[PDB]
C-alpha cells in the first residue's frame, strides 16, 4: 500500500476525513494513492503524530506551521490552499499597519500613538505587531496587556482586559469583542482609523479596499514599512510587516510522503474541488465549519520542494512568533557565509582576526547561503550579478559592490586563427560559459542573443559548448570537462567553471568563450603556470564586438558585449546598515594594502564601494539586466528562485 494517513483534531473532521477516504477509492485506480484517517485531540497531537510517524499529513494555520517546524517535529510545508481566482491564486494574506496620510511617524515611533487593532490574540491585527514591536514595549512585559497598555498611549483592543488594563479600550470602551462592538474585527479596526479614534490599524492588506470603494479616499491613507518608510496602500507587497500563509499542509521533512500527498490532494480537486458538484465536496462540510479544509479554499497549489518552514513564513512573521514564544531581548557579530572547505578557512582566518567583529557560517551551494541570510542563520556574502537577482527576488539587498579599478567589460573571445567567426553569426557554433545564470559568462551574452531569436533555448542555437549548471544530458555540457558526477556542475570539481575554466574551454574545444575583459590577459603570456594556458599568447585571441568586427584583446573598450555589473555584497533590510559599518571598517584595516583563487571575495577586487543610490537589486543591476534574465527564466530553472517566486511573483 501507499497510503496517506490523514491527521484529524475532531469527530466531524474524522468524518469527512472517512467520506473522503471512501470517495477516492472509486476515481483513482489501485495504482494509486490511498487515505487513512487517523483522529487526534488537537492540532498539537497531530504534529507529534505526523513526526511520530503515526500519521502524515495535516493542514495548519500559520502560527501552527511554526510549531510544526521546530524540533523535534521537523515538519516542512507541502501544499498551500488558494483562494479566489484560478488565474489569481491568492495564497497569502499580508499584516499592514495603515495610518493616515501625513501623520509624520514610522514604525519605529509608534510608542505612545493610539492603535487600533481588530482583537487580541488575532494575527494581523495582534500577535504579528505586537511580537515585531515586543522588544519595544517597556519591562515587565508580563503580562503583555499590561506592557503594550504602557506602550501606546491609548487603544482599542477587543477582547482585551480593560477592567485591568483600561487604556487597551480607550478607543472602544468595555473592549467588547463582539461585532456589537464598532471598531471589532477587520473592519472595526479599520474603521477606529478611519473616524479619527485612533493613529494606526493593525489589520489585512485587503481591509482598506473592501471599505473604500473609491481610490480617492484610498489616496488618504498610508502604510508604515519595516525600514522606517511609507509606501501607499495599494504598495501593500513591499510594505508590510508580515506576508502570512492562509492554511497549509504540512509532511515530515525526510520520509514524506510529500510525492503522495500532492497526487492524492490534486486528483481529489479534480473530481470534488469547487464546482464539480458531486455527492462529495472536499471544501464543503454538511456538518460542521472548515472541516479538514477552509470551506472558503478553490484549490490546492504544490509548495516548491526548496521552501523549508522559516522561508515559507517569512523572516519578519517568524521574528514576531519567536518573540511571542520565547520572549528574549538583548550590531552584533557579522555572520559571513563561506562555501567550500577551502572558503570557510579564509573566513575563520578573517574572524579571528576580525577579533569578534565577524564570525563564520557555512553552507554547501551558494543558494544554501542565500538562504541562511534570508532567515537569519547567516548575514553577508558576496554575490555575482546573477547571484543578486536570485537573492533580490528573494528580498536581499545589495550593501557594498567590489570594485576593480561603472563596472567592467563583458566580452566574446574568439581563437584568432578562426577569422570565419563573427557577432552576427555564431548559429551552429560551441560556446564556453562560466556558467548558466551568471553576469559575464550567460546573462549578459544569452540575453542579446535572445533579442536576435526570441528564444531562451540555447541548446539547438549552438552546436555544443560547455555551460555549467545545465542539465547533464544537454549539448551545452558535452563540452565540459568534470569527471563522474562532477561533469558540467557549477563548481569547481568542473575545470571548465568560472572566468578561467570558460577560457580553458575556449583554447581546447570551444569556438567562443564569454568571459570579463580581464580573463585574456590574466591567462596567458605565461601568467598562468597551468600546462593548458603557460604557452598562450594575448595575440592570439580576438574579442567579437557588436558591430559584427573583431579586434585585439586589449582593446575591450571598443569591443565590448556590454558593461557589467561588479559582484555585491548582499544582506536582508534590517542588517544593511551594520553590515556598511563593520565591513567599510574591515576594509579600512585590511583592504588593498586568498590562498586558492577567488575565496569569499573576488581576488581582482580593491575595495568594496559605498551604493546610496542603487541599494535595491532592479536599482544596482540596471533596467536591460533585469528585464534580459526575466527573458532568460523561461528556459531555466533555479529551485531556490522557484520558491521566493512563489512568495513575491
Ligand atoms: O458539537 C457537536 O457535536 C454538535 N453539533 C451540532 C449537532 O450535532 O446537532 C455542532 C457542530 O458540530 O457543528
Ligand atoms: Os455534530
Ligand atoms: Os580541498
Ligand atoms: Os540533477
Ligand atoms: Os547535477
Ligand atoms: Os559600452
Ligand atoms: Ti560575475
Redesign the pocket.
Known amino acids: 500500500d501507499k497510503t496517506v494517513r490523514w491527521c484529524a483534531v475532531?469527530?466531524?473532521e474524522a468524518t469527512k476525513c472517512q467520506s473522503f477516504r471512501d470517495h477516492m477509492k472509486s476515481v483513482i485506480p489501485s495504482d494509486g494513492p490511498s487515505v487513512a484517517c487517523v483522529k487526534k485531540a488537537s492540532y498539537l497531537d497531530c504534529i507529534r503524530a505526523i513526526a511520530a510517524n503515526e500519521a502524515d499529513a495535516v493542514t495548519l494555520d500559520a502560527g501552527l506551521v511554526y510549531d510544526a517546524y521546530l524540533a523535534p517535529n521537523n515538519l516542512k510545508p507541502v501544499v498551500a490552499e488558494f483562494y479566489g481566482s484560478k488565474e489569481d491564486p491568492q495564497t497569502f494574506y499580508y499584516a499592514v499597519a495603515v495610518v493616515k496620510k501625513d501623520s509624520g511617524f514610522q514604525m519605529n515611533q509608534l510608542r505612545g500613538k493610539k492603535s487600533c487593532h481588530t482583537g487580541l490574540g488575532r494575527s494581523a491585527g495582534w500577535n504579528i505587531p505586537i511580537g515585531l514591536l515586543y522588544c519595544d514595549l517597556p519591562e515587565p512585559r508580563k503580562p503583555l496587556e499590561k506592557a503594550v497598555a504602557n506602550f501606546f498611549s491609548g487603544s482599542c483592543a477587543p477582547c482585551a482586559d480593560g477592567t485591568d488594563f483600561p487604556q487597551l479600550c480607550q478607543l472602544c470602551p468595555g473592549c467588547g469583542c463582539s461585532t456589537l462592538n464598532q471598531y471589532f474585527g477587520y473592519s472595526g479596526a479599520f474603521k477606529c482609523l478611519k473616524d479619527g479614534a485612533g493613529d494606526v490599524a493593525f489589520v489585512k492588506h485587503s481591509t482598506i479596499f473592501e471599505n473604500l470603494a473609491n481610490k480617492a479616499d484610498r489616496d488618504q491613507y498610508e502604510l508604515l514599512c519595516l525600514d522606517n518608510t511609507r509606501k501607499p496602500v495599494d504598495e501593500y507587497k513591499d510594505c508590510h510587516l508580515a506576508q502570512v500563509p492562509s492554511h497549509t499542509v504540512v509532511a515530515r521533512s525526510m520520509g514524506g510522503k510529500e510525492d503522495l500527498i500532492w497526487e492524492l490532494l490534486n486528483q481529489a480537486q479534480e473530481h470534488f474541488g469547487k464546482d464539480k458538484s458531486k455527492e462529495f465536496q472536499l471544501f464543503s462540510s454538511p456538518?460542521?465549519?472548515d472541516l479538514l479544509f477552509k470551506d472558503s479554499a478553490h484549490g490546492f497549489l504544490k509548495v516548491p520542494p526548496r521552501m523549508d518552514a522559516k522561508m515559507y513564513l517569512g523572516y519578519e512573521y517568524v521574528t514576531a512568533i519567536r518573540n511571542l514564544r520565547e520572549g528574549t531581548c538583548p550590531c552584533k557579530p557579522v555572520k559571513w557565509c563561506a562555501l567550500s572547505h577551502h572558503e570557510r578557512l579564509k573566513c575563520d582566518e578573517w574572524s579571528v582576526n576580525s577579533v569578534g567583529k565577524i564570525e563564520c557560517v557555512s553552507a554547501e551551494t551558494t543558494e544554501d547561503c542565500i538562504a541562511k541570510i534570508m532567515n537569519g542563520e547567516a548575514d553577508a556574502m558576496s554575490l555575482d550579478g546573477g547571484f543578486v537577482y536570485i537573492a533580490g527576488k528573494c528580498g536581499l539587498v545589495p550593501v557594498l559592490a567590489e570594485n576593480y579599478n561603472a563596472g567592467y567589460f563583458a566580452v566574446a573571445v574568439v581563437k584568432k586563427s578562426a577569422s570565419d567567426l563573427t557577432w552576427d553569426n555564431l548559429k551552429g557554433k560551441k560556446s564556453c560559459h562560466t556558467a548558466v545564470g551568471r553576469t559575464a559568462g550567460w546573462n549578459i551574452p544569452m540575453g542579446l542573443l535572445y533579442n536576435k531569436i526570441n528564444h531562451c533555448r540555447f541548446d539547438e542555437f549552438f552546436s555544443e559548448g560547455c555551460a555549467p549548471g545545465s542539465k547533464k544530458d544537454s549539448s551545452l555540457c558535452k563540452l565540459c570537462m568534470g569527471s563522474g558526477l562532477n561533469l558540467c556542475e557549477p563548481n569547481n570539481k568542473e575545470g571548465y567553471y568560472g572566468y578561467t575554466g570558460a577560457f580553458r574551454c575556449l583554447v581546447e574545444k570551444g569556438d567562443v568563450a564569454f568571459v570579463k575583459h580581464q580573463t585574456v590577459p590574466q591567462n596567458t603570456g605565461g601568467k598562468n603556470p597551468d600546462p593548458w594556458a603557460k604557452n598562450l599568447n594575448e595575440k592570439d585571441y580576438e574579442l567579437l564586438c557588436l558591430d559584427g568586427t573583431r579586434k585585439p584583446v586589449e582593446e575591450y573598450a571598443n569591443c565590448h558585449l556590454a558593461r557589467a555589473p561588479n559582484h555585491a555584497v548582499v544582506t536582508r533590510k534590517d542588517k544593511e546598515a551594520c553590515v556598511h559599518k563593520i565591513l567599510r571598517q574591515q576594509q579600512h584595516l585590511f583592504g588593498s594594502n586568498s590562498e586558492t583563487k577567488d575565496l569569499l571575495f573576488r581576488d581582482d577586487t580593491v575595495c568594496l564601494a559605498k551604493l546610496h543610490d542603487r541599494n535595491t537589486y532592479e536599482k544596482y543591476l540596471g533596467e536591460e539586466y533585469v528585464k534580459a534574465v526575466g527573458n532568460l527564466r523561461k528556459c531555466s530553472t533555479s529551485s531556490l528562485l522557484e520558491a521566493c517566486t512563489f512568495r513575491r511573483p
Open positions: 475532531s469527530e466531524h456538518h460542521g465549519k
